[PDB]
Symmetry: D4
Subunit: 120 residues, 8 copies
């Protein structure tokens, strides 16, 4: 359907399987897509018929910076969960969590996880 995007949110977090990651921290990034009907928000100009994109950013910050998991998968799942419980008007969401500076000896732009979740 229609979509709200938040591109390239950047947080400093302490996620990781290695304990050294858990105390040093590192950049994390998230690309958020939520699907919902925006027709009537665009015709009414009434934010209350949509989802305040600023709250969606806050929801992500809460998971990435105020929680510590081992896997980036858990970052994605928890963000997707929090979105669907709090915003009923959202039907599906696609969350991409990016680790641009992983502890991999090599040369690459980033590693990331991407999930899509909707309502049973």
């Amino acid at each position: 359907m229609d979509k709200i995007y938040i591109h390239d949110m950047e947080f400093y977090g302490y996620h990781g399987v290695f304990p050294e990651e858990n105390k040093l921290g590192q950049r994390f990034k998230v690309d958020l897509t939520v699907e919902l009907d925006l027709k009537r928000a665009g015709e009414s100009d009434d934010l209350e018929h949509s989802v305040n994109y600023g709250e969606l950013f806050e929801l992500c910050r809460k998971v990435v910076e105020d929680r510590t998991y081992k896997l980036v998968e858990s970052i994605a799942e928890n963000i997707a969960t929090d979105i669907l419980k709090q915003y009923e008007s959202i039907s599906r969401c696609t969350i991409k969590v990016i680790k641009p500076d992983p502890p991999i000896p090599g040369h690459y732009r980033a590693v990331a996880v991407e999930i899509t979740r909707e309502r049973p």
Copy 2:
């Protein structure tokens, strides 16, 4: 299924939910996609069989710069409506309205809404 694109059109507008936004203004960007047959134009080299991409740009500039709305949803909706009302070869259009510098305390590249519309 053929497409005309206008990538990363940039405008200075005064849309926004917060009154302080309506006074200062800020950057807005629009990615435009329209769908229509281009095979006939391509074989004849006759612009009458397509749509002048310069008119599509002017249509977007007038919604973004000559109007003021609370929501970016309204920018996308008005662009889509004007395109489908004005252009008779276009069966569908996707409009992405980007707010690269929204007033959200945090770190990110941009927020955006994207809609797809066709005529009933």
Copy 3:
């Protein structure tokens, strides 16, 4: 479903509806995607079972630099037709022809047309 890409070919050409464009010339860019089965070439390391990507580039250059049309729709249509006429191991092709510096008073990345063609 296997694909060969050529990203962001750049040429200088003289296409355009305005006679002034046909005199001055300008930059043109092309994104090429051709679909074909590549497993046979992959498991045999034999180029005879694939398509030499250098020949694809030369095909695009000839249409863009050795010809002059008025519409960019005509560039794409002529590249796609020449692709399918020359290699019927290619089942499909998507041609994006980009005009990064058109004569439009405004601010934008570029305008482009994109087409997908297959044999009837």
Copy 4:
């Protein structure tokens, strides 16, 4: 389904059709996507229910840097084969092998092959 990405891995390799390439070498890039169910791991935060992204990188480094093929097609096919053969959890994978600096006289960003492999 859900996805693990490894973006823009960079290697120096000696693949190529021309013997001159086989001893000079050049850059090669790989974009890796694998598809699997990440719901388990997201719930449990246990890496045994996912695929260690470091192992996927090492798999790609072996094919690109430790061996020499004539075609990029062969690089992608061998990465895909090695991936699907070592992980039952992965249902599909897409491998894009980029040659950024091929010996094509002209102007472009890169050439690439992209394949998608599931289980026959």
Copy 5:
């Protein structure tokens, strides 16, 4: 001394030696640097002791979009003159005028002229 920068101003103008350029127009970009003492301004937080950078932008926009010359040298010379004319607190200014899309058959980022002017 201290400096105020305006990076990568973008305008659309009709400058050029060829009549075709004067008709079609093209992008122009300006980089502006002006030198003056900013200590007292940073000590007092009082704009009366500096130069409103927004007036410096309008000054450059007026020369590039409200005037038309044959040469980019004249754009730079007229910006520098207007600056020293209107803002006596500026000791020196460096104007860089960029023509990114000139009618030159070839491949390049841009051509530019850069001048430095001072109070006699």
Copy 6:
């Protein structure tokens, strides 16, 4: 002399001369250069013969995010002061405070002020 750089620090602040800026806030960026003798630290590998670049970051963070000024001039001047006050080993520093999204109707990359300070 030898230099320590911090490139492109990004903060969210509420500086600006318009009260609407003090309410909404906007991105702020800082480029930091300090000059000092680094030979000893180089030969000894001892941080105590240098300056912790993390302390320099935190020093810049307070000025930008924990205070509100009308002029970016004040930001730059207060960072340079705190550096020279607290790090006797530093003989000179250059502070570039960047405003990427100012409320200027137009198109540009950023505005910035840059200063250089040493001890009298």
Copy 7:
């Protein structure tokens, strides 16, 4: 002194110490700066008092694409010699010759040489 720039000219040449490079070729880039008084050209709007930047581009294209040297140093030297031989008004020039894809096993952006030559 006043400056004319040509940024990031891109050519395809066959320069190289290794004979394999002379057969395959590769990308070459050039950044050009020339110094001369531009203020009479800026005041009269007459190109007779400046240097046609399109002539400068062709001069570099001639050295990079119409000849084959072993070293990038010879490319830089011959460009500079040709500029100072033809344009008496040019008192100094800086030539940067860039090999972005040298046959060096490793990871990097480019290697380059840069010379400055001035008039007797």
Copy 8:
């Protein structure tokens, strides 16, 4: 005062003050500039009158990848020392060592040290 540049060399290394860094490793980038006379090499096209930039890269790889220091200062000093010890023709060199992903909780592009050395 001619120059050889090597831009944006990328290595994976284990330098750092914190033991956690010595275990995980991270990216390190180096910008090298060496100053010498290139006229003789440019006139003769004879590599023996310059310095093979391939050796300079290897010299830099040695220090970043085959060694571990606490400070990036020590990386820079050792690259400079080995350059001036090994190459008589080089009269001066400037080394910038970049840490793009340091363990600093914040948002920035990179930290770096830069030294210039010549023979006393």
